[PDB]
């Protein structure tokens, strides 16, 4: 029915905008992020006593807004489960809710209602709204990428950590020995460790500095080595991030080929098996399916030199040399 | 031949799958849905726009010379089908097993009938091993 | 006419030096940049009260120089529109002026005349001369490249931003909790946020430092993570800049091939269609055109392995294997 | 043949396109401009310097043996023209359409006459589709 | 015997977990590292006088734990030498101990017993437990990689060192000249060198800053150059680490091919030479060996485009073109 | 003569160790560098008044050492010009000295003699010994590489400079506006520029910090952008250095092929033209030359995939497809 | 032939190398160890699982048609053996010397008898140089 | 033939270029220097060590069968010489000009006589253009 297909269209569209954004769909998630960010900022302001009544008023209003949007978010999201046999029916909606993020969405909902109803419990509930903030990335992507890259470049990272740690242990010791007496910053080796950490990371607060000439010489000498070493992981991770995401893009690109391949083989076998209602049907299916399917397959096939191009290259060449041998033995 | 001219008789009015030479995209889609195809309006439109002489649905059916006369034996077809198998032929060497064939056909893309897929596993290559040679399949579509 | 072609030559040359510099042409733009930079510096000096009269004198003289060069710049630029049918005639000059940078050039001109005529309006007009400074890059190139790269590596960047932001939120909270009592720098969570931002970026002013042992342990531990994370975008952008500009260079390189290709095909078809005034004409056109065109085409064809070399490789190989099949079926 | 020797008669003095064996680069350019070619002095100079025996314009016209005797059937020519089509043949497969041919000819490089471009779209390949085979064109210049 | 093969299995397993860890085997080394780290931390705590008696008690207990685990580590490790003819028999165990790390393990053992028996000697022995810490990486891997990369990128590194050093020498000189008089931080060129080192490394303690306008201008100008230059080695090393470890992974990957190749050739020659007890033997060896060996060889052969794929490509193509010539001369 | 060939050998060897070091030859240049570095350090020490007499004594002794080694360096270097017809004979030695570094070597020599003979002139001469230090890299390599890379990646660098400069201009302005009143660090826009430069480079001395909440918000916000931007050139240069030196290594590798190629072609043509004193001569030259020349050529030919391998690939394939066509037309 | 059917007589019960059609993996391993093979249980299991009809050891011995009927002349075999030589043939050109052959055989992988390795150095290629052509060896296994 | 056996007569004692079968590396070098070759001791040593039967200079001259019997027509030679031209043949297409030939021969590597280089520019390819085909040169050494 026209109402039925309007239902289906809005169903699917809101589902996509909520669960799997893309393009302008990000505007809604930007809205939610700004909402929660505003809640955090307004809480921070409420901490500053010298002006908090205005903050409290605006915070109550913002909490109303949060309560309504989050509840509507939940309901629309659950209803937005009519795009597959997967989460349909009452039981399907229940399984959709068992999905862990829907849970914490329910908890932030009830936390909001508790806050508006109403000091440990209050701090807890507000912390739950901050839980929504950390829940922003649902499908792990920021975490999965980070862990994947850290594991992949484990050797480099462990080298950097080991040498940096060991430089930090020894430089701190030597400087502490040099300045144990005159300088008062380095009263104990703990202080020297603090200084070494602040120095090798290039933070350099300057609350703890060498004073003796020997101390300064040692500090500079070890600084060169360390400074080089603690900055290393950032470079390693940057390179690894670029590489890993490039690989993901390539891989994700290949599945785009998967659909047309099925299209072509389904059309080909069905049409061949078939070969004037029936004849008009076969005519149309031949013409439309092939002209579309072959086309799309082709525009999906060409790019990415890496290994893809050379794989097709090798395949074609292999049968070519196979037939070189075959034709030569056929001649003589 | 007889079937070609007989279908051309309907094609003269159904170049856009209707009773009159026109754009007839929606009519074509409804007719196909009655036939059981149930296509999409956008799918019909893109197709009509691509292969066309008048480029407005009411083409002077040069597809009389396309559909029947073209044996669909273009080497582009063979290369395309080989590539289509490649994405499924992990490590190649006729990698497809009939199980994978039925899996893809009945679970992905257009979910063809399991009986049709069994007929595919029979006619295309009776052996039904994990090493079904792809040259036969591209010939199977083209010549065999 | 000789005067006419001198007119055309100077026309085109000044056009290129003003609008599309290259090689030594950059010297003039360096001159303009130093002029505007000197204006900025002299204004800064005029702010320093203890010596400003000399600054004002030199600034008036510099403003005369600016006024004359900018007006002449405008006139020469507009006149420098005789290189194509595009901006010729009175109406063409009008459309050349409608181009947005020519506008702001007119505004900086009138701002200069207003300054020499003559406190909000004065500050505005001087700000307009600074507008010229920001107008330096006309054709967006510094902006377009930056935006393009930021968008391309969006995943990496969002990961870094997300994790860094979240580390900054939590480290600041924990340190604030640890040092809420003893330390006086961390009077409120706002202060802790300030400290965390200054620390994780490795600025480290040192106005706000941890004092308790627990605070220092937390600060160092979180410092390691953060420091690694806030430094990440710089590495990502550096890699992306290199990659994007490399791609642009390749692409720009290919259009260099476009001209010779047309040359060859025009010469070939025309000469073939033609084939003793006419015979001498055909002789000369054959010899000169081909010997030049083929040559230049060739020197424009070879380099860039990437995909280019392998594309020509595949093309040649495809017809080779095509004929392998053809010859074998021709034999038997 | 008759035309070759007849043109060689003028070539004996016009090796640099003039009435006397000399560098005659400017004279050649002016003569071409009178003929309607209107070349550039730098263009004439580079060309004369490249293919030359004396290397000063007043070459002993070995181009008698170059122009007529060379059928311009060098495989380098065929490869070059194929590459020339490549830059315009996006995705290949005879990608050029006659519209693109006229566009490039009349809008870019040397803007040949639209009538000449129509004659190209006719003689080079009468079909005028988007799949004009390039082998015919390289033969068209070389042999066909 | 069943007891004999249990002996062999545990022998080999403990050998692998001690000498060549992999996967979950790292948990034991993590345990040891945490043990030694805890010893270091507890010593640091013992330095802090205001609470050291608890530290001493816990340190004595930890030293008992260290003594027992290290002694058992030694014994189990030496016994764990029954996996090859290499270190078997009493003499083999002696050679296993001559291996240098086993030595320092013995010294840390005896140092621990000396500490529990019992101020220079005590400091020495505790330093020996820290020697165990630095002994963590046995087979040099953190050191070998670092040295290899430093040597490989020697040119880049020397450029950075040279220019950075020279900028540091001259900037310090000029700033010292500018601020010799007014500023009191720059009392002598030594002080200026200290300032320059702290500045160019971006530590910036802030104990020594320029004050005169000229000094600040010089400091900023030179800062730009230097700051760029001292940060360079970290980037170079990061790239080199990634590259070198990638190369090592590729190389290590190729030896994985070495075993199957021998398997295939041994099976092939033996089976061919052989070709119904004998016939059943040949049947089984044919079937099982080939079906396994060829398989494994194949899964070990395909990946890594780099040079590997193109090497196989070239090899196959070389004999193909060889036979092109051969067949053509055979035809005519 | 045996004395004559000893002369030639030592000639060439000392020439190589002085002018073109390699391997252990660097030890001598390390010696010279440590000598000049020690002179610099001892001068610095002589500045520190509270102990300078010892410094002066050791400096006089070091100056004797410098004088003798530098004079001997000069003489040995000039004499070390007997390895080619290039710098032989009295006139050849004169041209060897006209080479600019030999000049400044002469000046540092005479500066040393002036110092030992003996306040502006003295400071000058000591500065000349520092000139020797900067002369360390003779053949420009640290400078040539830096300039080459800066020019190659000009686009990226200008983007970074432009955006960073413009962020620095505006952030400084806004912060100055925010804190013009309360804060006393930002008394004038000059001060704000100083603060902005120290902040965006992540030095962060901390002498100038924001105090108002608005100032801090602006400072942090702009810090994020800037900090990212000023760190960019270091990454760009690191990548460019790696890339450029890799290219140089490849290029330098190819000339290694140049010698064997000449060897092979000289041997081949000479031996062919020749084809039993003469027969024994031809026999020996054939056998020895070819077995050596072909060998060495081969070990010099294979590596470097990049373009080299694919260039040989394409060449061989081109004649292969050429003969495919030829053989097919020969058959039919 | 006679030997094939004679071995098939035992194979009918020893499809898993035993006296009864069963999984008989451990029995097969013990029988091989008695024969002197001394295999591993995991090695036997993987092998049985791979090539199998029933896929449980008690396959209906289609390996009667595998072992004897398959001449082991598959081009995959030739390519595999060529690749196997490649990893040992540094710089190629028949790089293997008989010394390297004996070294690898007697020091790595399965340590075959030195007499067997000498017989390999004799039969496979009598020349025993550092340039033993690999085409003969792949034929030596396949055809030669 | 006559010359081969005549040279073998001296070779029986001059396998290391002397009067007795020995290492005779220094004697060989001195003899060559007398002949005008003037080789290096290290150059002689490496060569003797490479191609050898006894591997100590006093080889049982299997180079009787190497030098004369080997026509030096190995395809490795042709490939090597082609590669040798490649490094000098910038952009290929017979890129070498006789000027470049004389330049390299007389300025680099072994500085052969200018007369010998002129004889090379004549015999190897009389044309002396910038497009001297390399196939003739590799044949010129091998067969032509
Ligand atoms: C003046 C000037 C201002 C300057 C700024 C300019 C702004 C630039 C914004 C540019 C980009 C627009 C957004 C584009 C965008 O989101 O790009 C996405 C990355 O998305 C995420 O990582 C997903 C989201 C993860 C993180 C969510 C929370 C992030 C909060 C950030 C807070 C930052 C606070 C900032 C404060 C700084 C420190 C105080 C790349 O999209 P894509 O092209 O890679 O395609 C997607 C994408 O990769 C998805 O991540 C991926 O799913 P995941 O598994 O979740 O990764 C899809 O695969 P599947 O379909 O198979 O699942 C892919 O199909
Ligand atoms: C909140 C969040 C917390 C965030 C952190 C998440 C943690 C991440 C941990 C991830 C990785 C798990 C460990 C994996 C792992 O160890 O990866 C290894 C690297 O191992 C070493 O370098 C060997 C060990 C060398 C260093 C030993 C001491 C290290 C002490 C580190 C102390 C760091 C202190 C931290 C304080 C920081 C500063 C105060 C890569 O393993 P692989 O896949 O490369 O394979 C091995 C490996 O490369 C071996 O290194 C190599 O032998 P070597 O010659 O010794 O290199 C093998 O070759 P062969 O069999 O031919 O000998 C390879 O077969
Ligand atoms: K910093
Ligand atoms: K700092
Ligand atoms: K800092
Ligand atoms: K600081």
PDB file of C-alpha atoms in Angstrom, chain F residues 40-175:
ATOM      1  CA  UNK F  40      85.848  25.470  21.051  1.00  0.00           C
ATOM      2  CA  UNK F  41      85.209  23.921  24.456  1.00  0.00           C
ATOM      3  CA  UNK F  42      88.487  25.186  25.841  1.00  0.00           C
ATOM      4  CA  UNK F  43      87.722  28.688  24.596  1.00  0.00           C
ATOM      5  CA  UNK F  44      84.315  28.531  26.280  1.00  0.00           C
ATOM      6  CA  UNK F  45      86.074  27.495  29.465  1.00  0.00           C
ATOM      7  CA  UNK F  46      88.539  30.357  29.095  1.00  0.00           C
ATOM      8  CA  UNK F  47      85.562  32.703  29.143  1.00  0.00           C
ATOM      9  CA  UNK F  48      84.621  31.512  32.652  1.00  0.00           C
ATOM     10  CA  UNK F  49      86.866  33.813  34.658  1.00  0.00           C
ATOM     11  CA  UNK F  50      86.843  31.957  37.967  1.00  0.00           C
ATOM     12  CA  UNK F  51      89.064  29.331  36.337  1.00  0.00           C
ATOM     13  CA  UNK F  52      90.827  30.424  33.159  1.00  0.00           C
ATOM     14  CA  UNK F  53      94.582  30.120  33.720  1.00  0.00           C
ATOM     15  CA  UNK F  54      94.455  26.338  33.400  1.00  0.00           C
ATOM     16  CA  UNK F  55      92.245  26.788  30.351  1.00  0.00           C
ATOM     17  CA  UNK F  56      94.784  29.172  28.819  1.00  0.00           C
ATOM     18  CA  UNK F  57      97.655  26.766  29.428  1.00  0.00           C
ATOM     19  CA  UNK F  58      95.809  23.832  27.906  1.00  0.00           C
ATOM     20  CA  UNK F  59      94.656  26.097  25.082  1.00  0.00           C
ATOM     21  CA  UNK F  60      98.207  27.087  24.198  1.00  0.00           C
ATOM     22  CA  UNK F  61      99.215  23.439  24.116  1.00  0.00           C
ATOM     23  CA  UNK F  62      96.165  22.580  22.024  1.00  0.00           C
ATOM     24  CA  UNK F  63      97.046  25.415  19.665  1.00  0.00           C
ATOM     25  CA  UNK F  64     100.506  23.935  19.160  1.00  0.00           C
ATOM     26  CA  UNK F  65      98.839  20.637  18.313  1.00  0.00           C
ATOM     27  CA  UNK F  66      96.432  22.374  15.947  1.00  0.00           C
ATOM     28  CA  UNK F  67      99.233  24.301  14.242  1.00  0.00           C
ATOM     29  CA  UNK F  68     101.299  21.203  13.616  1.00  0.00           C
ATOM     30  CA  UNK F  69      98.451  18.963  12.453  1.00  0.00           C
ATOM     31  CA  UNK F  70      96.936  21.647  10.209  1.00  0.00           C
ATOM     32  CA  UNK F  71     100.234  22.486   8.560  1.00  0.00           C
ATOM     33  CA  UNK F  72     101.006  18.826   8.060  1.00  0.00           C
ATOM     34  CA  UNK F  73      97.432  18.379   6.898  1.00  0.00           C
ATOM     35  CA  UNK F  74      97.953  21.047   4.246  1.00  0.00           C
ATOM     36  CA  UNK F  75     101.294  19.732   3.029  1.00  0.00           C
ATOM     37  CA  UNK F  76     100.213  16.098   2.959  1.00  0.00           C
ATOM     38  CA  UNK F  77      96.979  17.077   1.230  1.00  0.00           C
ATOM     39  CA  UNK F  78      98.688  19.072  -1.507  1.00  0.00           C
ATOM     40  CA  UNK F  79     101.289  16.354  -2.005  1.00  0.00           C
ATOM     41  CA  UNK F  80      98.402  13.899  -2.066  1.00  0.00           C
ATOM     42  CA  UNK F  81      97.670  15.114  -5.540  1.00  0.00           C
ATOM     43  CA  UNK F  82      99.444  12.344  -7.439  1.00  0.00           C
ATOM     44  CA  UNK F  83      96.605  10.068  -8.515  1.00  0.00           C
ATOM     45  CA  UNK F  84      95.697  11.629 -11.847  1.00  0.00           C
ATOM     46  CA  UNK F  85      97.071  13.833 -14.594  1.00  0.00           C
ATOM     47  CA  UNK F  86      94.615  16.399 -13.165  1.00  0.00           C
ATOM     48  CA  UNK F  87      96.749  17.893 -10.338  1.00  0.00           C
ATOM     49  CA  UNK F  88     100.358  16.934 -11.181  1.00  0.00           C
ATOM     50  CA  UNK F  89     103.325  19.210 -11.631  1.00  0.00           C
ATOM     51  CA  UNK F  90     103.922  22.541  -9.948  1.00  0.00           C
ATOM     52  CA  UNK F  91     101.109  24.174 -11.923  1.00  0.00           C
ATOM     53  CA  UNK F  92      98.773  21.323 -11.020  1.00  0.00           C
ATOM     54  CA  UNK F  93      99.492  21.813  -7.325  1.00  0.00           C
ATOM     55  CA  UNK F  94      98.685  25.491  -7.751  1.00  0.00           C
ATOM     56  CA  UNK F  95      95.280  24.678  -9.224  1.00  0.00           C
ATOM     57  CA  UNK F  96      94.710  22.169  -6.431  1.00  0.00           C
ATOM     58  CA  UNK F  97      95.273  25.026  -3.977  1.00  0.00           C
ATOM     59  CA  UNK F  98      92.956  27.404  -5.860  1.00  0.00           C
ATOM     60  CA  UNK F  99      90.178  25.033  -4.831  1.00  0.00           C
ATOM     61  CA  UNK F 100      88.240  27.083  -2.286  1.00  0.00           C
ATOM     62  CA  UNK F 101      88.511  24.867   0.780  1.00  0.00           C
ATOM     63  CA  UNK F 102      92.286  24.709   0.430  1.00  0.00           C
ATOM     64  CA  UNK F 103      92.162  28.478   0.662  1.00  0.00           C
ATOM     65  CA  UNK F 104      90.290  28.587   3.967  1.00  0.00           C
ATOM     66  CA  UNK F 105      92.629  25.860   5.176  1.00  0.00           C
ATOM     67  CA  UNK F 106      95.483  28.248   4.462  1.00  0.00           C
ATOM     68  CA  UNK F 107      93.664  31.028   6.323  1.00  0.00           C
ATOM     69  CA  UNK F 108      93.044  28.871   9.386  1.00  0.00           C
ATOM     70  CA  UNK F 109      96.723  27.935   9.253  1.00  0.00           C
ATOM     71  CA  UNK F 110      97.820  31.565   9.279  1.00  0.00           C
ATOM     72  CA  UNK F 111      95.199  32.374  11.897  1.00  0.00           C
ATOM     73  CA  UNK F 112      96.711  29.733  14.146  1.00  0.00           C
ATOM     74  CA  UNK F 113     100.200  31.131  13.643  1.00  0.00           C
ATOM     75  CA  UNK F 114      98.850  34.595  14.456  1.00  0.00           C
ATOM     76  CA  UNK F 115      97.211  33.312  17.632  1.00  0.00           C
ATOM     77  CA  UNK F 116     100.432  31.708  18.789  1.00  0.00           C
ATOM     78  CA  UNK F 117     102.280  34.911  17.910  1.00  0.00           C
ATOM     79  CA  UNK F 118      99.922  36.795  20.227  1.00  0.00           C
ATOM     80  CA  UNK F 119      91.471  42.606  21.270  1.00  0.00           C
ATOM     81  CA  UNK F 120      89.478  42.435  18.037  1.00  0.00           C
ATOM     82  CA  UNK F 121      92.097  40.682  15.894  1.00  0.00           C
ATOM     83  CA  UNK F 122      92.476  37.810  18.360  1.00  0.00           C
ATOM     84  CA  UNK F 123      88.725  37.271  18.465  1.00  0.00           C
ATOM     85  CA  UNK F 124      88.766  37.279  14.666  1.00  0.00           C
ATOM     86  CA  UNK F 125      91.491  34.635  14.411  1.00  0.00           C
ATOM     87  CA  UNK F 126      89.851  32.338  16.946  1.00  0.00           C
ATOM     88  CA  UNK F 127      86.659  32.810  14.896  1.00  0.00           C
ATOM     89  CA  UNK F 128      88.750  31.565  11.945  1.00  0.00           C
ATOM     90  CA  UNK F 129      89.451  28.306  13.801  1.00  0.00           C
ATOM     91  CA  UNK F 130      85.671  28.087  14.205  1.00  0.00           C
ATOM     92  CA  UNK F 131      85.565  28.652  10.440  1.00  0.00           C
ATOM     93  CA  UNK F 132      87.485  25.413  10.149  1.00  0.00           C
ATOM     94  CA  UNK F 133      84.732  23.790  12.182  1.00  0.00           C
ATOM     95  CA  UNK F 134      82.034  25.001   9.806  1.00  0.00           C
ATOM     96  CA  UNK F 135      84.290  23.879   6.943  1.00  0.00           C
ATOM     97  CA  UNK F 136      84.003  20.257   8.139  1.00  0.00           C
ATOM     98  CA  UNK F 137      81.605  19.262   5.403  1.00  0.00           C
ATOM     99  CA  UNK F 138      83.723  20.185   2.432  1.00  0.00           C
ATOM    100  CA  UNK F 139      81.889  18.860  -0.595  1.00  0.00           C
ATOM    101  CA  UNK F 140      78.461  20.281   0.084  1.00  0.00           C
ATOM    102  CA  UNK F 141      76.238  17.442   1.141  1.00  0.00           C
ATOM    103  CA  UNK F 142      74.452  18.612   4.242  1.00  0.00           C
ATOM    104  CA  UNK F 143      73.644  21.872   2.518  1.00  0.00           C
ATOM    105  CA  UNK F 144      72.876  20.480  -0.928  1.00  0.00           C
ATOM    106  CA  UNK F 145      70.515  17.863   0.456  1.00  0.00           C
ATOM    107  CA  UNK F 146      68.698  20.391   2.619  1.00  0.00           C
ATOM    108  CA  UNK F 147      68.240  22.881  -0.186  1.00  0.00           C
ATOM    109  CA  UNK F 148      67.197  20.200  -2.631  1.00  0.00           C
ATOM    110  CA  UNK F 149      64.537  18.842  -0.310  1.00  0.00           C
ATOM    111  CA  UNK F 150      63.225  22.265   0.666  1.00  0.00           C
ATOM    112  CA  UNK F 151      62.823  23.146  -2.984  1.00  0.00           C
ATOM    113  CA  UNK F 152      61.276  19.816  -3.929  1.00  0.00           C
ATOM    114  CA  UNK F 153      58.536  19.987  -1.302  1.00  0.00           C
ATOM    115  CA  UNK F 154      57.939  23.679  -1.762  1.00  0.00           C
ATOM    116  CA  UNK F 155      54.146  23.504  -1.948  1.00  0.00           C
ATOM    117  CA  UNK F 156      53.676  21.644   1.325  1.00  0.00           C
ATOM    118  CA  UNK F 157      56.146  23.893   3.060  1.00  0.00           C
ATOM    119  CA  UNK F 158      54.565  27.099   1.838  1.00  0.00           C
ATOM    120  CA  UNK F 159      51.153  25.878   2.919  1.00  0.00           C
ATOM    121  CA  UNK F 160      52.456  25.165   6.388  1.00  0.00           C
ATOM    122  CA  UNK F 161      54.295  28.470   6.600  1.00  0.00           C
ATOM    123  CA  UNK F 162      51.348  30.478   5.322  1.00  0.00           C
ATOM    124  CA  UNK F 163      48.699  28.972   7.542  1.00  0.00           C
ATOM    125  CA  UNK F 164      50.962  28.877  10.564  1.00  0.00           C
ATOM    126  CA  UNK F 165      51.983  32.475  10.061  1.00  0.00           C
ATOM    127  CA  UNK F 166      48.413  33.569   9.657  1.00  0.00           C
ATOM    128  CA  UNK F 167      47.220  31.664  12.712  1.00  0.00           C
ATOM    129  CA  UNK F 168      50.066  33.242  14.630  1.00  0.00           C
ATOM    130  CA  UNK F 169      49.067  36.699  13.451  1.00  0.00           C
ATOM    131  CA  UNK F 170      45.411  36.347  14.361  1.00  0.00           C
ATOM    132  CA  UNK F 171      45.623  34.289  17.543  1.00  0.00           C
ATOM    133  CA  UNK F 172      48.111  36.759  18.920  1.00  0.00           C
ATOM    134  CA  UNK F 173      45.793  39.614  18.026  1.00  0.00           C
ATOM    135  CA  UNK F 174      42.723  38.072  19.622  1.00  0.00           C
ATOM    136  CA  UNK F 175      44.531  37.052  22.785  1.00  0.00           C
TER     137      UNK F 175
END
